[PDB]
Design a binder for these strands. Structure first.
Ligand SMILES: [Zn+2]
Length: 240
DNA sequence: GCGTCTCGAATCTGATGCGTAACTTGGATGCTTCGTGCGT
């Protein structure tokens, strides 16, 4: 895939809705997924309504929405893709911690989109940049766009295991929060501050926010075993 | 019209108890769409 809207016609294969206008002016980017809207394509003027609180993430002021985004803005699409991973084969659910560990330790090779919501249901279909290479995974968490490097996650897990190797009571070296909301998120704990070497402390302080978020779901006393997430595109298509 | 001597001294100089108790020891929110109907 190339664009967030490309997930529709490639893994959902949903035909465009009826009654959509046809573009007849100089091409302009979509207001959601930044896809160009060329002459002869199907679009619709923006009618997001007063309850749309994602104006800051709009690609442009074209006020035009391509049919793929019009599909992606349906309630069944927003709810189904709350904790989704959209790859070529299908849409997978990464809600469970084991799924997150598998994704951030053994990512799929193909381009994919990573979905995650910080509340009941949020606009995430059209805000996630594509992950071209598995070594640089871009994850959209609520209003935060994260960059996760699997090698950094593996190195941090190795550091935590080596620091907790001797002590019988397991204790995390770095303070992390699943919601990425705590005031101490990403800061070293007392055990990390006074039981780790200078190189390990410098590495743990110099990780990206996305890596902290991922370790908040992976790094624990009993590391979850990675497992393949289930196929979810069937459920979303049936509910639509 | 003073007048001067003497113009202190020893010793005690604190003891004893009490010298905390019970209860609170958080709570709530931070999402949009969709259908149906008002409605100004
Ligand atoms: Zn679009």
């Amino acid at each position: 895939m190339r664009y967030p809207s490309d997930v529709v016609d490639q893994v959902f294969k949903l035909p465009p809705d009826k009654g959509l206008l046809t573009w007849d002016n100089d091409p302009v980017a979509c207001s959601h997924c930044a896809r160009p809207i060329e002459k002869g394509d199907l679009y619709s003027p923006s009618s997001v309504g007063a309850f749309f609180s994602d104006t800051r993430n709009l690609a442009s002021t074209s006020r035009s929405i391509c049919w793929r985004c019009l599909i992606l803005r349906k309630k069944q699409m927003l709810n189904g893709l709350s904790y989704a991973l959209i790859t070529q084969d299908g849409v997978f659910q990464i809600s469970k911690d084991t799924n997150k560990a598998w994704l951030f330790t053994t990512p799929p090779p193909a381009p994919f989109f990573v979905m995650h919501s910080s509340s009941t249901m949020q606009h995430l279909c059209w805000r996630t940049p594509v992950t071209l290479d598995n070594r640089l995974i871009k994850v959209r968490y609520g209003n935060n766009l994260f960059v996760v490097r699997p090698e950094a996650i593996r190195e941090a897990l190795e550091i935590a295991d080596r620091m907790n190797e001797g002590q019988k009571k397991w204790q995390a070296p770095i303070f992390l929060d699943r919601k990425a909301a705590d005031s101490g998120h990403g800061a070293l704990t007392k055990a990390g501050r006074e039981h780790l070497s200078a190189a390990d402390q410098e590495f743990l302080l110099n990780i990206t926010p996305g890596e902290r978020w991922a370790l908040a779901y992976i790094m624990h006393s009993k590391r979850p075993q990675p497992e393949e997430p289930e196929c979810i595109t069937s459920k979303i298509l049936e509910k639509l």
